[PDB]
mmCIF file of all heavy atoms in Angstrom:
data_model
loop_
_atom_site.group_PDB
_atom_site.id
_atom_site.type_symbol
_atom_site.label_atom_id
_atom_site.label_comp_id
_atom_site.label_asym_id
_atom_site.label_seq_id
_atom_site.Cartn_x
_atom_site.Cartn_y
_atom_site.Cartn_z
ATOM 1 N N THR A 141 0.916 -1.138 -0.044
ATOM 2 C CA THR A 141 0.018 0.006 -0.009
ATOM 3 C C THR A 141 0.958 1.182 0.003
ATOM 4 O O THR A 141 2.128 1.025 0.242
ATOM 5 C CB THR A 141 -0.880 -0.165 1.252
ATOM 6 O OG1 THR A 141 -0.033 -0.473 2.314
ATOM 7 C CG2 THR A 141 -1.700 -1.493 1.199
ATOM 8 N N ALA A 142 0.525 2.397 -0.276
ATOM 9 C CA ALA A 142 1.433 3.512 -0.283
ATOM 10 C C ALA A 142 1.403 4.225 1.119
ATOM 11 O O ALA A 142 0.577 3.891 1.951
ATOM 12 C CB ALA A 142 1.072 4.457 -1.397
ATOM 13 N N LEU A 143 2.215 5.181 1.227
ATOM 14 C CA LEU A 143 2.386 5.985 2.453
ATOM 15 C C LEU A 143 2.046 7.390 2.108
ATOM 16 O O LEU A 143 1.423 8.078 2.865
ATOM 17 C CB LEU A 143 3.861 5.961 2.988
ATOM 18 C CG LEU A 143 4.313 4.590 3.443
ATOM 19 C CD1 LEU A 143 5.780 4.713 3.891
ATOM 20 C CD2 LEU A 143 3.465 4.091 4.676
ATOM 21 N N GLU A 144 2.455 7.764 0.921
ATOM 22 C CA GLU A 144 2.133 9.166 0.532
ATOM 23 C C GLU A 144 0.829 8.958 -0.369
ATOM 24 O O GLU A 144 0.643 7.820 -0.886
ATOM 25 C CB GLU A 144 3.186 9.719 -0.317
ATOM 26 C CG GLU A 144 4.292 10.344 0.534
ATOM 27 C CD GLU A 144 5.234 11.121 -0.352
ATOM 28 O OE1 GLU A 144 6.052 10.451 -1.022
ATOM 29 O OE2 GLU A 144 5.083 12.339 -0.430
ATOM 30 N N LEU A 145 0.027 9.908 -0.513
ATOM 31 C CA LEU A 145 -1.214 9.748 -1.321
ATOM 32 C C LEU A 145 -0.898 9.659 -2.800
ATOM 33 O O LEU A 145 -0.140 10.486 -3.348
ATOM 34 C CB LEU A 145 -2.143 10.994 -1.082
ATOM 35 C CG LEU A 145 -3.487 10.940 -1.870
ATOM 36 C CD1 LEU A 145 -4.343 9.742 -1.436
ATOM 37 C CD2 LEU A 145 -4.331 12.191 -1.605
ATOM 38 N N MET A 146 -1.435 8.683 -3.448
ATOM 39 C CA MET A 146 -1.156 8.499 -4.910
ATOM 40 C C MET A 146 -2.402 8.910 -5.729
ATOM 41 O O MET A 146 -3.546 8.647 -5.283
ATOM 42 C CB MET A 146 -0.784 7.010 -5.253
ATOM 43 C CG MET A 146 0.544 6.534 -4.500
ATOM 44 S SD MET A 146 2.079 7.456 -4.786
ATOM 45 C CE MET A 146 2.366 7.013 -6.525
ATOM 46 N N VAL A 147 -2.210 9.531 -6.858
ATOM 47 C CA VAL A 147 -3.322 9.974 -7.750
ATOM 48 C C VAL A 147 -3.052 9.452 -9.192
ATOM 49 O O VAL A 147 -1.914 9.525 -9.641
ATOM 50 C CB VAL A 147 -3.434 11.471 -7.692
ATOM 51 C CG1 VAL A 147 -2.173 12.109 -8.278
ATOM 52 C CG2 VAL A 147 -4.684 11.875 -8.504
ATOM 53 N N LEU A 148 -4.079 8.987 -9.843
ATOM 54 C CA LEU A 148 -3.915 8.438 -11.273
ATOM 55 C C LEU A 148 -5.014 9.035 -12.213
ATOM 56 O O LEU A 148 -6.141 9.067 -11.868
ATOM 57 C CB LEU A 148 -4.036 6.889 -11.182
ATOM 58 C CG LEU A 148 -4.053 6.190 -12.603
ATOM 59 C CD1 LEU A 148 -2.730 6.305 -13.271
ATOM 60 C CD2 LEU A 148 -4.489 4.767 -12.372
ATOM 61 N N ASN A 149 -4.620 9.461 -13.379
ATOM 62 C CA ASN A 149 -5.589 10.051 -14.357
ATOM 63 C C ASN A 149 -6.082 8.882 -15.191
ATOM 64 O O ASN A 149 -5.276 8.378 -15.990
ATOM 65 C CB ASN A 149 -4.904 11.050 -15.264
ATOM 66 C CG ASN A 149 -5.919 12.199 -15.574
ATOM 67 O OD1 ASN A 149 -5.499 13.060 -16.262
ATOM 68 N ND2 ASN A 149 -7.086 12.165 -15.073
ATOM 69 N N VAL A 150 -7.317 8.470 -15.125
ATOM 70 C CA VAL A 150 -7.753 7.352 -15.952
ATOM 71 C C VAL A 150 -8.820 7.892 -17.028
ATOM 72 O O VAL A 150 -9.547 8.820 -16.661
ATOM 73 C CB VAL A 150 -8.335 6.265 -15.048
ATOM 74 C CG1 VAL A 150 -7.264 5.714 -14.188
ATOM 75 C CG2 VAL A 150 -9.435 6.839 -14.103
ATOM 76 N N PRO A 151 -8.867 7.385 -18.234
ATOM 77 C CA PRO A 151 -9.948 7.686 -19.155
ATOM 78 C C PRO A 151 -11.205 6.849 -18.909
ATOM 79 O O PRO A 151 -11.169 5.655 -18.573
ATOM 80 C CB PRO A 151 -9.354 7.439 -20.564
ATOM 81 C CG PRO A 151 -8.383 6.255 -20.328
ATOM 82 C CD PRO A 151 -7.872 6.488 -18.825
ATOM 83 N N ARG A 152 -12.346 7.496 -19.071
ATOM 84 C CA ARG A 152 -13.640 6.752 -18.848
ATOM 85 C C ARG A 152 -14.068 6.073 -20.172
ATOM 86 O O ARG A 152 -13.729 6.483 -21.248
ATOM 87 C CB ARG A 152 -14.665 7.770 -18.329
ATOM 88 C CG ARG A 152 -15.981 7.188 -17.895
ATOM 89 C CD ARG A 152 -16.997 8.391 -17.655
ATOM 90 N NE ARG A 152 -18.204 7.720 -17.136
ATOM 91 C CZ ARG A 152 -19.068 8.314 -16.370
ATOM 92 N NH1 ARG A 152 -18.883 9.518 -16.003
ATOM 93 N NH2 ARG A 152 -20.072 7.620 -15.939
ATOM 94 N N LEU A 153 -14.850 4.996 -20.000
ATOM 95 C CA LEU A 153 -15.398 4.225 -21.138
ATOM 96 C C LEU A 153 -16.903 4.027 -20.968
ATOM 97 O O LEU A 153 -17.383 3.960 -19.861
ATOM 98 C CB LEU A 153 -14.875 2.710 -21.282
ATOM 99 C CG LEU A 153 -13.420 2.487 -21.823
ATOM 100 C CD1 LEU A 153 -12.350 2.828 -20.717
ATOM 101 C CD2 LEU A 153 -13.375 0.928 -22.157
ATOM 102 N N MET A 154 -17.554 3.948 -22.121
ATOM 103 C CA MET A 154 -19.041 3.697 -22.034
ATOM 104 C C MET A 154 -18.994 2.231 -21.949
ATOM 105 O O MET A 154 -18.120 1.584 -22.512
ATOM 106 C CB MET A 154 -19.736 4.213 -23.248
ATOM 107 C CG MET A 154 -19.905 5.776 -23.140
ATOM 108 S SD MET A 154 -21.083 6.520 -24.262
ATOM 109 C CE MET A 154 -22.619 5.724 -23.668
ATOM 110 N N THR A 155 -19.932 1.673 -21.227
ATOM 111 C CA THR A 155 -20.031 0.272 -21.045
ATOM 112 C C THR A 155 -19.945 -0.632 -22.334
ATOM 113 O O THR A 155 -19.349 -1.662 -22.289
ATOM 114 C CB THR A 155 -21.305 0.086 -20.277
ATOM 115 O OG1 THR A 155 -21.125 1.142 -19.308
ATOM 116 C CG2 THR A 155 -21.377 -1.182 -19.511
ATOM 117 N N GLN A 156 -20.512 -0.231 -23.441
ATOM 118 C CA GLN A 156 -20.409 -1.067 -24.683
ATOM 119 C C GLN A 156 -18.949 -1.319 -24.994
ATOM 120 O O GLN A 156 -18.502 -2.418 -25.268
ATOM 121 C CB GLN A 156 -21.099 -0.327 -25.906
ATOM 122 C CG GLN A 156 -22.647 -0.721 -25.911
ATOM 123 C CD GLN A 156 -23.286 0.084 -27.073
ATOM 124 O OE1 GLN A 156 -24.108 0.962 -26.779
ATOM 125 N NE2 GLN A 156 -22.937 -0.150 -28.321
ATOM 126 N N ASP A 157 -18.232 -0.276 -24.928
ATOM 127 C CA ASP A 157 -16.765 -0.414 -25.201
ATOM 128 C C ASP A 157 -16.048 -1.211 -24.117
ATOM 129 O O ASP A 157 -15.146 -1.936 -24.386
ATOM 130 C CB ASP A 157 -16.092 0.983 -25.249
ATOM 131 C CG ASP A 157 -16.323 1.782 -26.562
ATOM 132 O OD1 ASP A 157 -16.032 1.091 -27.582
ATOM 133 O OD2 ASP A 157 -16.773 2.852 -26.505
ATOM 134 N N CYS A 158 -16.492 -1.083 -22.847
ATOM 135 C CA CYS A 158 -15.800 -1.864 -21.793
ATOM 136 C C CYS A 158 -16.085 -3.324 -22.124
ATOM 137 O O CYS A 158 -15.155 -4.151 -22.198
ATOM 138 C CB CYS A 158 -16.393 -1.514 -20.379
ATOM 139 S SG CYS A 158 -15.568 -2.120 -18.944
ATOM 140 N N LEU A 159 -17.288 -3.637 -22.275
ATOM 141 C CA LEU A 159 -17.705 -5.080 -22.530
ATOM 142 C C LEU A 159 -16.964 -5.581 -23.846
ATOM 143 O O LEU A 159 -16.546 -6.753 -23.931
ATOM 144 C CB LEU A 159 -19.183 -5.122 -22.815
ATOM 145 C CG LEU A 159 -19.993 -4.833 -21.524
ATOM 146 C CD1 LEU A 159 -21.476 -4.875 -21.935
ATOM 147 C CD2 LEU A 159 -19.767 -5.944 -20.508
ATOM 148 N N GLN A 160 -16.892 -4.728 -24.796
ATOM 149 C CA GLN A 160 -16.184 -5.073 -26.053
ATOM 150 C C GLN A 160 -14.701 -5.299 -25.828
ATOM 151 O O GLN A 160 -14.078 -6.135 -26.470
ATOM 152 C CB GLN A 160 -16.433 -3.851 -27.042
ATOM 153 C CG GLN A 160 -15.391 -3.711 -28.208
ATOM 154 C CD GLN A 160 -15.055 -2.203 -28.438
ATOM 155 O OE1 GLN A 160 -14.898 -1.404 -27.533
ATOM 156 N NE2 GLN A 160 -14.898 -1.734 -29.619
ATOM 157 N N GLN A 161 -14.075 -4.548 -24.963
ATOM 158 C CA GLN A 161 -12.582 -4.761 -24.734
ATOM 159 C C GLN A 161 -12.137 -5.629 -23.577
ATOM 160 O O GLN A 161 -10.988 -5.834 -23.479
ATOM 161 C CB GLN A 161 -11.970 -3.399 -24.518
ATOM 162 C CG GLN A 161 -12.222 -2.644 -25.859
ATOM 163 C CD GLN A 161 -11.737 -1.201 -25.690
ATOM 164 O OE1 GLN A 161 -10.650 -0.913 -25.243
ATOM 165 N NE2 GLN A 161 -12.503 -0.261 -26.064
ATOM 166 N N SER A 162 -13.063 -6.075 -22.770
ATOM 167 C CA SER A 162 -12.578 -6.899 -21.602
ATOM 168 C C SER A 162 -12.531 -8.341 -22.010
ATOM 169 O O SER A 162 -13.383 -8.778 -22.686
ATOM 170 C CB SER A 162 -13.484 -6.748 -20.399
ATOM 171 O OG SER A 162 -13.511 -5.386 -20.098
ATOM 172 N N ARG A 163 -11.505 -8.975 -21.479
ATOM 173 C CA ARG A 163 -11.210 -10.410 -21.656
ATOM 174 C C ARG A 163 -12.404 -10.967 -20.896
ATOM 175 O O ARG A 163 -12.451 -10.956 -19.665
ATOM 176 C CB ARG A 163 -9.884 -10.751 -21.005
ATOM 177 C CG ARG A 163 -9.016 -11.493 -22.140
ATOM 178 C CD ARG A 163 -7.609 -11.818 -21.497
ATOM 179 N NE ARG A 163 -6.659 -10.781 -21.988
ATOM 180 C CZ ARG A 163 -5.545 -11.107 -22.522
ATOM 181 N NH1 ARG A 163 -5.118 -12.372 -22.679
ATOM 182 N NH2 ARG A 163 -4.717 -10.142 -22.942
ATOM 183 N N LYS A 164 -13.333 -11.541 -21.627
ATOM 184 C CA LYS A 164 -14.583 -12.130 -21.051
ATOM 185 C C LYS A 164 -14.702 -12.403 -19.622
ATOM 186 O O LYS A 164 -15.508 -11.719 -18.963
ATOM 187 C CB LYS A 164 -14.896 -13.481 -21.880
ATOM 188 C CG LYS A 164 -16.489 -13.472 -21.865
ATOM 189 C CD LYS A 164 -17.109 -14.545 -22.779
ATOM 190 C CE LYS A 164 -18.628 -14.615 -22.456
ATOM 191 N NZ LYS A 164 -19.281 -13.224 -22.435
ATOM 192 N N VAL A 165 -14.025 -13.376 -18.979
ATOM 193 C CA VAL A 165 -14.262 -13.548 -17.538
ATOM 194 C C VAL A 165 -13.118 -13.861 -16.467
ATOM 195 O O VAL A 165 -11.953 -13.895 -16.673
ATOM 196 C CB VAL A 165 -15.429 -14.670 -17.360
ATOM 197 C CG1 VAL A 165 -16.519 -14.526 -18.526
ATOM 198 C CG2 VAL A 165 -14.867 -16.138 -17.391
ATOM 199 N N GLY A 166 -13.783 -14.087 -15.373
ATOM 200 C CA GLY A 166 -13.379 -14.415 -13.967
ATOM 201 C C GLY A 166 -14.787 -14.563 -13.425
ATOM 202 O O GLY A 166 -15.782 -14.488 -14.182
ATOM 203 N N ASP A 167 -15.057 -14.767 -12.138
ATOM 204 C CA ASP A 167 -16.522 -14.892 -11.758
ATOM 205 C C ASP A 167 -16.861 -13.402 -11.448
ATOM 206 O O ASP A 167 -17.105 -13.030 -10.342
ATOM 207 C CB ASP A 167 -16.716 -15.789 -10.472
ATOM 208 C CG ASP A 167 -15.905 -15.277 -9.222
ATOM 209 O OD1 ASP A 167 -14.698 -15.277 -9.357
ATOM 210 O OD2 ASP A 167 -16.557 -14.925 -8.301
ATOM 211 N N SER A 168 -16.814 -12.666 -12.523
ATOM 212 C CA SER A 168 -17.117 -11.181 -12.435
ATOM 213 C C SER A 168 -18.622 -10.963 -12.133
ATOM 214 O O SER A 168 -19.492 -11.805 -12.402
ATOM 215 C CB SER A 168 -16.844 -10.622 -13.795
ATOM 216 O OG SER A 168 -15.595 -11.228 -14.209
ATOM 217 N N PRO A 169 -18.841 -9.851 -11.524
ATOM 218 C CA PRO A 169 -20.143 -9.130 -11.618
ATOM 219 C C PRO A 169 -20.325 -8.611 -13.044
ATOM 220 O O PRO A 169 -19.391 -8.762 -13.820
ATOM 221 C CB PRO A 169 -20.164 -8.068 -10.549
ATOM 222 C CG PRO A 169 -18.949 -8.445 -9.670
ATOM 223 C CD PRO A 169 -17.928 -9.086 -10.638
ATOM 224 N N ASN A 170 -21.401 -8.023 -13.293
ATOM 225 C CA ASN A 170 -21.713 -7.443 -14.599
ATOM 226 C C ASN A 170 -21.408 -5.954 -14.403
ATOM 227 O O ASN A 170 -21.212 -5.572 -13.254
ATOM 228 C CB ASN A 170 -23.187 -7.492 -15.011
ATOM 229 C CG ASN A 170 -23.605 -8.903 -15.411
ATOM 230 O OD1 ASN A 170 -23.312 -9.404 -16.470
ATOM 231 N ND2 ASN A 170 -24.329 -9.596 -14.584
ATOM 232 N N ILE A 171 -21.397 -5.233 -15.422
ATOM 233 C CA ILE A 171 -21.158 -3.791 -15.308
ATOM 234 C C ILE A 171 -22.598 -3.293 -15.322
ATOM 235 O O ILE A 171 -23.125 -3.165 -16.422
ATOM 236 C CB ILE A 171 -20.301 -3.287 -16.509
ATOM 237 C CG1 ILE A 171 -19.021 -4.189 -16.723
ATOM 238 C CG2 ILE A 171 -19.887 -1.815 -16.311
ATOM 239 C CD1 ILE A 171 -17.935 -3.944 -15.652
ATOM 240 N N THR A 172 -23.166 -3.006 -14.201
ATOM 241 C CA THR A 172 -24.558 -2.566 -14.310
ATOM 242 C C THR A 172 -24.620 -1.044 -14.589
ATOM 243 O O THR A 172 -23.601 -0.431 -14.880
ATOM 244 C CB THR A 172 -25.317 -2.864 -13.000
ATOM 245 O OG1 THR A 172 -24.875 -1.959 -12.010
ATOM 246 C CG2 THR A 172 -24.923 -4.251 -12.487
ATOM 247 N N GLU A 173 -25.799 -0.545 -14.533
ATOM 248 C CA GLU A 173 -25.962 0.904 -14.837
ATOM 249 C C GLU A 173 -25.622 1.718 -13.588
ATOM 250 O O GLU A 173 -25.733 2.966 -13.600
ATOM 251 C CB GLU A 173 -27.473 1.198 -15.310
ATOM 252 C CG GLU A 173 -28.522 1.017 -14.112
ATOM 253 C CD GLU A 173 -29.106 -0.418 -13.906
ATOM 254 O OE1 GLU A 173 -28.343 -1.375 -13.815
ATOM 255 O OE2 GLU A 173 -30.366 -0.480 -13.798
ATOM 256 N N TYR A 174 -25.203 1.031 -12.560
ATOM 257 C CA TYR A 174 -24.823 1.668 -11.284
ATOM 258 C C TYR A 174 -23.289 1.643 -11.189
ATOM 259 O O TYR A 174 -22.738 1.784 -10.102
ATOM 260 C CB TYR A 174 -25.482 0.848 -10.114
ATOM 261 C CG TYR A 174 -26.988 1.020 -10.149
ATOM 262 C CD1 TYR A 174 -27.832 -0.038 -10.478
ATOM 263 C CD2 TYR A 174 -27.534 2.231 -9.975
ATOM 264 C CE1 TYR A 174 -29.169 0.157 -10.539
ATOM 265 C CE2 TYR A 174 -28.866 2.450 -10.020
ATOM 266 C CZ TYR A 174 -29.690 1.440 -10.328
ATOM 267 O OH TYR A 174 -31.095 1.683 -10.397
ATOM 268 N N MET A 175 -22.676 1.387 -12.267
ATOM 269 C CA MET A 175 -21.179 1.331 -12.357
ATOM 270 C C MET A 175 -20.760 1.838 -13.671
ATOM 271 O O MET A 175 -21.670 2.105 -14.459
ATOM 272 C CB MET A 175 -20.679 -0.157 -12.258
ATOM 273 C CG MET A 175 -21.364 -0.976 -11.347
ATOM 274 S SD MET A 175 -20.945 -2.706 -11.580
ATOM 275 C CE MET A 175 -21.908 -3.533 -10.360
ATOM 276 N N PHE A 176 -19.515 1.947 -13.827
ATOM 277 C CA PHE A 176 -18.904 2.431 -15.153
ATOM 278 C C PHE A 176 -17.454 1.987 -15.057
ATOM 279 O O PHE A 176 -17.009 1.670 -14.001
ATOM 280 C CB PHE A 176 -19.028 3.959 -15.227
ATOM 281 C CG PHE A 176 -18.159 4.973 -14.474
ATOM 282 C CD1 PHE A 176 -16.892 5.200 -14.880
ATOM 283 C CD2 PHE A 176 -18.695 5.613 -13.396
ATOM 284 C CE1 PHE A 176 -16.149 6.154 -14.208
ATOM 285 C CE2 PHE A 176 -17.936 6.551 -12.736
ATOM 286 C CZ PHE A 176 -16.678 6.826 -13.141
ATOM 287 N N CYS A 177 -16.806 1.952 -16.195
ATOM 288 C CA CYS A 177 -15.402 1.503 -16.331
ATOM 289 C C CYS A 177 -14.450 2.615 -16.696
ATOM 290 O O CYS A 177 -14.855 3.466 -17.516
ATOM 291 C CB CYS A 177 -15.261 0.377 -17.405
ATOM 292 S SG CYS A 177 -16.197 -1.148 -17.271
ATOM 293 N N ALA A 178 -13.287 2.585 -16.144
ATOM 294 C CA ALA A 178 -12.254 3.643 -16.483
ATOM 295 C C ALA A 178 -10.928 2.927 -16.304
ATOM 296 O O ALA A 178 -10.816 1.921 -15.565
ATOM 297 C CB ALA A 178 -12.475 4.860 -15.471
ATOM 298 N N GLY A 179 -9.957 3.379 -16.967
ATOM 299 C CA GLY A 179 -8.607 2.716 -16.831
ATOM 300 C C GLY A 179 -7.938 2.441 -18.201
ATOM 301 O O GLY A 179 -8.221 3.122 -19.197
ATOM 302 N N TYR A 180 -7.090 1.511 -18.136
ATOM 303 C CA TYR A 180 -6.283 1.014 -19.287
ATOM 304 C C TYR A 180 -6.381 -0.484 -19.269
ATOM 305 O O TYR A 180 -6.493 -0.992 -18.170
ATOM 306 C CB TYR A 180 -4.872 1.418 -19.082
ATOM 307 C CG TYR A 180 -4.781 2.952 -18.980
ATOM 308 C CD1 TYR A 180 -4.942 3.617 -17.775
ATOM 309 C CD2 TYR A 180 -4.487 3.629 -20.098
ATOM 310 C CE1 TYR A 180 -4.867 5.015 -17.774
ATOM 311 C CE2 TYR A 180 -4.368 4.995 -20.102
ATOM 312 C CZ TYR A 180 -4.584 5.684 -18.943
ATOM 313 O OH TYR A 180 -4.416 7.061 -18.992
ATOM 314 N N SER A 181 -6.285 -1.108 -20.389
ATOM 315 C CA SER A 181 -6.361 -2.618 -20.403
ATOM 316 C C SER A 181 -5.042 -3.234 -20.709
ATOM 317 O O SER A 181 -4.911 -4.435 -20.751
ATOM 318 C CB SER A 181 -7.442 -2.953 -21.480
ATOM 319 O OG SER A 181 -7.044 -2.079 -22.572
ATOM 320 N N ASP A 182 -3.985 -2.409 -20.906
ATOM 321 C CA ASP A 182 -2.612 -2.895 -21.183
ATOM 322 C C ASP A 182 -1.827 -3.056 -19.806
ATOM 323 O O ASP A 182 -0.633 -3.033 -19.739
ATOM 324 C CB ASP A 182 -1.840 -1.795 -21.959
ATOM 325 C CG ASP A 182 -1.792 -0.447 -21.195
ATOM 326 O OD1 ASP A 182 -2.307 -0.424 -20.144
ATOM 327 O OD2 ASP A 182 -1.252 0.534 -21.751
ATOM 328 N N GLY A 183 -2.557 -3.375 -18.737
ATOM 329 C CA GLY A 183 -1.961 -3.540 -17.385
ATOM 330 C C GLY A 183 -0.860 -2.560 -16.909
ATOM 331 O O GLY A 183 0.106 -2.954 -16.268
ATOM 332 N N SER A 184 -1.032 -1.303 -17.175
ATOM 333 C CA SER A 184 0.022 -0.365 -16.741
ATOM 334 C C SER A 184 -0.458 0.541 -15.568
ATOM 335 O O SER A 184 0.229 0.772 -14.570
ATOM 336 C CB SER A 184 0.268 0.562 -17.933
ATOM 337 O OG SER A 184 -0.999 0.923 -18.400
ATOM 338 N N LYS A 185 -1.729 1.002 -15.692
ATOM 339 C CA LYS A 185 -2.392 1.887 -14.681
ATOM 340 C C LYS A 185 -3.770 1.449 -14.208
ATOM 341 O O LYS A 185 -4.562 0.944 -15.022
ATOM 342 C CB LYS A 185 -2.469 3.199 -15.338
ATOM 343 C CG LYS A 185 -1.135 3.792 -15.621
ATOM 344 C CD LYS A 185 -1.292 4.955 -16.586
ATOM 345 C CE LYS A 185 0.090 5.567 -16.731
ATOM 346 N NZ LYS A 185 0.002 6.753 -17.659
ATOM 347 N N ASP A 186 -4.051 1.628 -12.957
ATOM 348 C CA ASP A 186 -5.334 1.243 -12.404
ATOM 349 C C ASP A 186 -5.388 1.564 -10.907
ATOM 350 O O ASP A 186 -4.380 1.955 -10.310
ATOM 351 C CB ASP A 186 -5.616 -0.249 -12.553
ATOM 352 C CG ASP A 186 -7.010 -0.791 -12.231
ATOM 353 O OD1 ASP A 186 -7.987 -0.048 -12.352
ATOM 354 O OD2 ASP A 186 -7.176 -1.944 -11.867
ATOM 355 N N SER A 187 -6.513 1.381 -10.303
ATOM 356 C CA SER A 187 -6.739 1.630 -8.795
ATOM 357 C C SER A 187 -6.502 0.195 -8.317
ATOM 358 O O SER A 187 -6.466 -0.703 -9.122
ATOM 359 C CB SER A 187 -8.142 2.266 -8.687
ATOM 360 O OG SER A 187 -7.783 3.494 -9.332
ATOM 361 N N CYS A 188 -6.399 -0.022 -7.037
ATOM 362 C CA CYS A 188 -6.204 -1.372 -6.482
ATOM 363 C C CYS A 188 -6.863 -1.385 -5.140
ATOM 364 O O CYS A 188 -7.497 -0.420 -4.731
ATOM 365 C CB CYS A 188 -4.670 -1.732 -6.411
ATOM 366 S SG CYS A 188 -4.300 -3.462 -6.184
#
């Protein structure tokens, strides 16, 4: 975990594009209308 506060700039995606770009599964939840996706899919940046 960090000690100093970390901040990351992520781009937002509309769900069609998220669903279209995500590697189908894990025992995921769905991306409902009460959620949204942001980030990168090249495993470089994300929240944890």
Side-chain angles (χ1 to χ4, degrees):
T141 47
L143 296 177
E144 275 191 282
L145 181 62
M146 297 303 291
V147 64
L148 174 69
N149 216 180
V150 294
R152 186 188 184 153
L153 286 73
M154 278 198 64
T155 314
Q156 271 177 245
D157 282 307
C158 189
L159 293 178
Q160 156 219 41
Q161 299 174 49
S162 302
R163 230 179 261 231
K164 214 170 170 47
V165 322
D167 56 297
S168 317
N170 287 284
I171 308 288
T172 73
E173 69 273 49
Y174 294 113
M175 317 169 182
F176 74 80
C177 302
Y180 301 84
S181 45
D182 58 2
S184 48
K185 296 165 175 180
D186 190 28
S187 292
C188 195

